[PDB]
Amino acid sequence: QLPYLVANVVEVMDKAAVVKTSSRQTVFLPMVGLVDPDKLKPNDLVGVNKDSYLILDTLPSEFDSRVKAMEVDEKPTETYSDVGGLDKQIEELVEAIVLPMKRADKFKDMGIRAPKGALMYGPPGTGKTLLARACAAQTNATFLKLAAPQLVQMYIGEGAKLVRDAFALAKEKAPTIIFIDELDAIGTKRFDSEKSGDREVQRTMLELLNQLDGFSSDDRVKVLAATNRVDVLDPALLRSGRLDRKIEFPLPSEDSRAQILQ
Amino acid sequence: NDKVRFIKDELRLLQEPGSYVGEVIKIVSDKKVLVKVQPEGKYIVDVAKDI
Amino acid sequence: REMFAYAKEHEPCIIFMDEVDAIGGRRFSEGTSADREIQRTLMELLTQMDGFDNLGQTKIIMATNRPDTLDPALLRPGRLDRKVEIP
Amino acid sequence: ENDLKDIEARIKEKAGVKESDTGLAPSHLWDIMGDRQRLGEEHPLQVARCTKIIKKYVINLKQIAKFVVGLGERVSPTDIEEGMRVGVDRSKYNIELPLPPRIDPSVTMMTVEEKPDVTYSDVGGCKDQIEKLREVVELPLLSPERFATLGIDPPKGILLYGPPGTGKTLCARAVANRTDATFIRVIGSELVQKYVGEGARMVRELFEMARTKKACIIFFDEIDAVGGARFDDGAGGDNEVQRTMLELITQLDGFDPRGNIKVMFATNRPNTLDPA
Amino acid sequence: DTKETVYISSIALLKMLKHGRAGVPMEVMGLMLGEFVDDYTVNVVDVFAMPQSGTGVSVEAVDDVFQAKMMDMLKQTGRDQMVVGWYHSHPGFGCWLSSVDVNTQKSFEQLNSRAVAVVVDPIQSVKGKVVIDAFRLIDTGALINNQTTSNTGLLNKANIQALIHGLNRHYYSLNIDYHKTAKETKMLMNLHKEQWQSGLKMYDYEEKEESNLAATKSMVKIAEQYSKRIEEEKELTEEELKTRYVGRQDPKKHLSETADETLENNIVSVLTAGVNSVAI
Amino acid sequence: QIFVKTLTGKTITLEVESSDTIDNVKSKIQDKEGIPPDQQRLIFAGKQLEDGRTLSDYNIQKESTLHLVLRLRGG
Amino acid sequence: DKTENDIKALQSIGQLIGEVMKELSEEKYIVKASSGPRYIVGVRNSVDRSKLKKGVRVTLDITTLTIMRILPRETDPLVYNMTSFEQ
Amino acid sequence: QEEEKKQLEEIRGNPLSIGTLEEIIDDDHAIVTSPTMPDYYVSILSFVDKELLEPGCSVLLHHKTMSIVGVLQDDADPMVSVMKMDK
Ligand SMILES: Nc1ncnc2c1ncn2[C@@H]1O[C@H](COP(=O)(O)OP(=O)(O)OP(=O)(O)O)[C@@H](O)[C@H]1O
Numbered sequence A: 001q002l003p004y005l006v007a008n009v010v011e012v013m014d015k016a017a018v019v020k021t022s023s024r025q026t027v028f029l030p031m032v033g034l035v036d037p038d039k040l041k042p043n044d045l046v047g048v049n050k051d052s053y054l055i056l057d058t059l060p061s062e063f064d065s066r067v068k069a070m071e072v073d074e075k076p077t078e079t080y081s082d083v084g085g086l087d088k089q090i091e092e093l094v095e096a097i098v099l100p101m102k103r104a105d106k107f108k109d110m111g112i113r114a115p116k117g118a119l120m121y122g123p124p125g126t127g128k129t130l131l132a133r134a135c136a137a138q139t140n141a142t143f144l145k146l147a148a149p150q151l152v153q154m155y156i157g158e159g160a161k162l163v164r165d166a167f168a169l170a171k172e173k174a175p176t177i178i179f180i181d182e183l184d185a186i187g188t189k190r191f192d193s194e195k196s197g198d199r200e201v202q203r204t205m206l207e208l209l210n211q212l213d214g215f216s217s218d219d220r221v222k223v224l225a226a227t228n229r230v231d232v233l234d235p236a237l238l239r240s241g242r243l244d245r246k247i248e249f250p251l252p253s254e255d256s257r258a259q260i261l262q
Numbered sequence B: 001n002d003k004v005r006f007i008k009d010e011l012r013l014l015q016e017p018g019s020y021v022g023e024v025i026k027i028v029s030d031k032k033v034l035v036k037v038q039p040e041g042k043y044i045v046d047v048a049k050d051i
Numbered sequence C: 001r002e003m004f005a006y007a008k009e010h011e012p013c014i015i016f017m018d019e020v021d022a023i024g025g026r027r028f029s030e031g032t033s034a035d036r037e038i039q040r041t042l043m044e045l046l047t048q049m050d051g052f053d054n055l056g057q058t059k060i061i062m063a064t065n066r067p068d069t070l071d072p073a074l075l076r077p078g079r080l081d082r083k084v085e086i087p
Numbered sequence D: 001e002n003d004l005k006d007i008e009a010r011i012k013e014k015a016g017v018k019e020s021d022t023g024l025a026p027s028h029l030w031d032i033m034g035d036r037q038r039l040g041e042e043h044p045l046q047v048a049r050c051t052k053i054i055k056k057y058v059i060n061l062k063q064i065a066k067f068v069v070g071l072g073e074r075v076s077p078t079d080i081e082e083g084m085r086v087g088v089d090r091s092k093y094n095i096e097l098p099l100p101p102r103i104d105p106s107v108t109m110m111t112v113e114e115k116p117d118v119t120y121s122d123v124g125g126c127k128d129q130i131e132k133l134r135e136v137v138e139l140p141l142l143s144p145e146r147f148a149t150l151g152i153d154p155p156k157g158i159l160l161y162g163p164p165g166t167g168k169t170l171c172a173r174a175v176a177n178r179t180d181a182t183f184i185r186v187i188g189s190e191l192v193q194k195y196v197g198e199g200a201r202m203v204r205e206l207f208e209m210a211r212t213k214k215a216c217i218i219f220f221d222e223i224d225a226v227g228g229a230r231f232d233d234g235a236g237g238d239n240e241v242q243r244t245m246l247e248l249i250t251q252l253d254g255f256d257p258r259g260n261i262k263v264m265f266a267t268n269r270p271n272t273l274d275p276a
Numbered sequence E: 001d002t003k004e005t006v007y008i009s010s011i012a013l014l015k016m017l018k019h020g021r022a023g024v025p026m027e028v029m030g031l032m033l034g035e036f037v038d039d040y041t042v043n044v045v046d047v048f049a050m051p052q053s054g055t056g057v058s059v060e061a062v063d064d065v066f067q068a069k070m071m072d073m074l075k076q077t078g079r080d081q082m083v084v085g086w087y088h089s090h091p092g093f094g095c096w097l098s099s100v101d102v103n104t105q106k107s108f109e110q111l112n113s114r115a116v117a118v119v120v121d122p123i124q125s126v127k128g129k130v131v132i133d134a135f136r137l138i139d140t141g142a143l144i145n146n147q148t149t150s151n152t153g154l155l156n157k158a159n160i161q162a163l164i165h166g167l168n169r170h171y172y173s174l175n176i177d178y179h180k181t182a183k184e185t186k187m188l189m190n191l192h193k194e195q196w197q198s199g200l201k202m203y204d205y206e207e208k209e210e211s212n213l214a215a216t217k218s219m220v221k222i223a224e225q226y227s228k229r230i231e232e233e234k235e236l237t238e239e240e241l242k243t244r245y246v247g248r249q250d251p252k253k254h255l256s257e258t259a260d261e262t263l264e265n266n267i268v269s270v271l272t273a274g275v276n277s278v279a280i
Numbered sequence F: 001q002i003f004v005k006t007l008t009g010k011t012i013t014l015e016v017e018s019s020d021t022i023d024n025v026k027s028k029i030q031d032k033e034g035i036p037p038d039q040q041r042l043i044f045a046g047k048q049l050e051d052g053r054t055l056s057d058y059n060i061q062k063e064s065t066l067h068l069v070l071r072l073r074g075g
Numbered sequence G: 001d002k003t004e005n006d007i008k009a010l011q012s013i014g015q016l017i018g019e020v021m022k023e024l025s026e027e028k029y030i031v032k033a034s035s036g037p038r039y040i041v042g043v044r045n046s047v048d049r050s051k052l053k054k055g056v057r058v059t060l061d062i063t064t065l066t067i068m069r070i071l072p073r074e075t076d077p078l079v080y081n082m083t084s085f086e087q
Numbered sequence H: 001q002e003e004e005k006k007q008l009e010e011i012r013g014n015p016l017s018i019g020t021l022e023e024i025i026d027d028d029h030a031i032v033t034s035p036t037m038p039d040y041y042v043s044i045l046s047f048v049d050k051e052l053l054e055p056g057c058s059v060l061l062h063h064k065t066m067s068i069v070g071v072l073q074d075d076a077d078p079m080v081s082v083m084k085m086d087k
């Protein structure tokens, strides 16, 4: 029948079946040879009955409206001539982004350990969010956005599913770019506790990491981020491989002051 | 006989249902009060013959 | 415990396990019954390693950066007896 | 003397009790249409909102419980789309009815509708500072033909700071009188609820309704509560309120959800609040 | 229109439970066979099952022929007779009917004006208090137009919408009985007949003495506190000779309950031996 | 005319001919037994009478035998 | 044979998962489900009461709550993996 | 006392649950939120002073089915009702 629900697999004994349904109701389950069990893998969601939890029909990964929304037009209209100073930082940046999007052979012939993303630290007002309004324009690719607190939500499985969607959505629709504006929220440190509110926050971060270390430098995503702070956030993000290349956006020198006003 | 009465009375009503607990907020006009079940929300009620 | 039983019947064998400073959590920072995971997860560690008898077919290694942050409620006296810095 | 209380409460055991809730005198005979309206084709529904319409009709309940369902007489293909609030049976979960997006009460408890009385002629003769104030607020809404043609994009945000007793809130209740557009009286007490990531939800909806409307402006007050500084402590019990304000600053300056909405603040501690 | 016994054949019932329980949690529905009588004994004979899509709360009959292809397959043996009613099941929820039940029941009655529904609730149906019940709808048309005869017997005090709704539209709720005969009760009780070996099996002793000089150990401690419990017992009231001593393990009984017992199971152990001795 | 039986074993007989529309036939039991045909299921020898292939392609002779069936739903 | 296989499975409805605290008798054990409570249960004939001890993972029905089957080796190869050539 | 009070308890059950409402529609169609249950789409019985109620209010819900039946004056909080003077 039609009224049925969704679940997520975790294992296969030995045919066999196990699930973690959405209602927080695990089931061990004798073998369903209904669907070909070799036609699926763990975390591959499936339909399932309401009373006799058994696999009934697979189904796709349908993303949430609060994520598709973050797909973007090219409403940004800000050329690199609209920005002053920072000929370096933009020069350093684009040697991580479009060339791996287009001209990665100079890496791939060498096959060097490639970079995955970026970071733009420094104080308020050096042109952080602006520059991402620019790079989304000039490049002929898509682009994405999410403030960090747009992730955190009340319910105890509201966030992690959100983030596994985006990166998965970005492996789809590829090649893509990610923007995380105020990473200072989630990325602080380990706030050790057993309370609800202390866990559901960080457990998002634990997904973000596994998402970064899940793909490779072959599929053509390229993430970045931003912050007003670096003496506050967790170095696990800064570990070699995840977010390695950095940018110390300074204050502007006095020559740069002449450009900005003009 | 009064022995077998008890155990046959007692056993009759361990089959009986549970019984909740709660606290009073105020009293509505008559034969009507309100309660909050101390973990959960509100439930207007009626009362019995005695009280 | 499964990580040891599996390790037992495949004797001899070595263990390695990093980020070991995570078992502490609260480390009974308040003694509330909400961190039972952060407490017991140290317990089952200790009770099991005491069960080896130290015969010579199973040994264990651990590591971190902050041994001054370690939990010497155990793992100091006779369990992780030999401490070894590195240059 | 100790007999009075025996007699006094003896009255309490004489009258009884009395209470009401609601009712009506003239249309006293309501109760012929009720029962016929009750069991008919006016069952209740149990709301949700869709996520996908596969060529069936996945849903997600408020509480985390996701189904995949079909219809009765409601139109399947056409009227519905993604997103909206809906109607679902209580027994076997078919779709029957749409309904619009959510509009939280609180923000509509937060809009002002009746206009106060003061004016800039009732203020205490701080004649200059008002001129820096209104030049932000109303002239870019009444006489933009000056700011634009000469070539200046006006500002869209003020802040007020002075010692107390000085009339920071006065001049702000005033301008609502001379608004020529809406106004908001944000109650800072509703942004600090004790469920994580919630207050921030109230922030962004506060603006989704704004830019829906045309030319809204906003009056915070005592943002020293919310716009406090930041720090790192493994206790950090102000951890949560930091996550709220970030719903604000990311929303004020990034990727322009803003059109013409202005902002207004107030303080007695303008040093502590975060530079951002 | 009262005093209507509903006899049931014991071959019918236990088939109603088994298929009525094997499908648990999802509910289940089948049919009854029997025969009306003048007014009173609407008996029942035998039942069976229509195929069906069962849920925890709802079900229908998928196929519309397996009940028709089988009666015509039965009369070759003629082990039963025609149809008289239909049952269904509410697995843990109580015994009553619903707006779906009446819509289908309302067909049977106008089809045949004494047909019957039956309701069962196997989960709470323990080895004692079964809760089965049956029902015949009314004519509320005949109600607004607006019966006992010198006996009524039994009424319910539970199942709310079988107790406040159970009359205004549900049914003239109606008792049941059982046709337990001698010809079958003989073949019925043939389970508990233990065995002809099952009364001279002098089982092992290595628990016996381990119970004997274990039991006396458990006698004294209750005795010598009953030795305490007779100190004077005339203290401060006649009720104070009673209510200062709650019944928290009243001692004198507790020894007698084992005094007789250890006597009663040992006297068999000794007697059984000497009888077994003369097996040879 | 025609015969019709039941699951109870009762018989009803109708006055019809080879020109019969199932939407009209289904109304006939409603004429007599008072059944909405949604609760109906007619049979001819294992072949459920589909409402489309009207009886002209079913060899419904005179004095033929049918079987009526009621739908079953509960909850 | 396929279309006849699947129906042979659909009747075999699902189960529920738990874990043990301790043991009391072959007629009564204790469990701890994966959704909170700490039921008391019995046990079926087939499974060896020997293997049932503390720590084990367990499966049982939904209504009667009687334990039948066990699944060990809570595999998670992302967690650990052997190095046999290290021998 | 003969007709009014004889009818209300006929349709108002003995338990009348309590909740709130996030939004309303004319013609006896409305909404509820509440802790124990999820939201609902609900009708009205038209003797509540229908042009009274507002968002954030509190309500009197029939139990078997949900239905907005009446509304209370304040139901503000207990402790505020303590601090007042009676003596
Ligand atoms: N180097 C620059 N070139 C051009 N404009 C600049 C530059 N630096 C600052 N600006 C101006 O400042 C604004 C952009 O500031 P920016 O995006 O750096 O804020 P931010 O540091 O991102 O704030 P936060 O870090 O809190 O998000 C723009 O309005 C822009 O006109």
Ligand SMILES: Nc1ncnc2c1ncn2[C@@H]1O[C@H](COP(=O)(O)OP(=O)(O)OP(=O)(O)O)[C@@H](O)[C@H]1O
Residues within 6 Å of the ligand: D122, D123, D124, D125, D126, D163, D164, D165, D166, D167, D168, D169, D170, D171, D222, D266, D267, D268
């Ligand atoms: N310039 C003024 N002319 C006339 N009255 C004034 C003036 N300034 C302050 N007041 C008086 O003070 C009150 C408001 O003072 P003000 O707006 O400074 O409060 P506030 O600074 O918002 O208080 P807080 O600092 O606690 O937020 C008014 O009710 C008014 O009576």
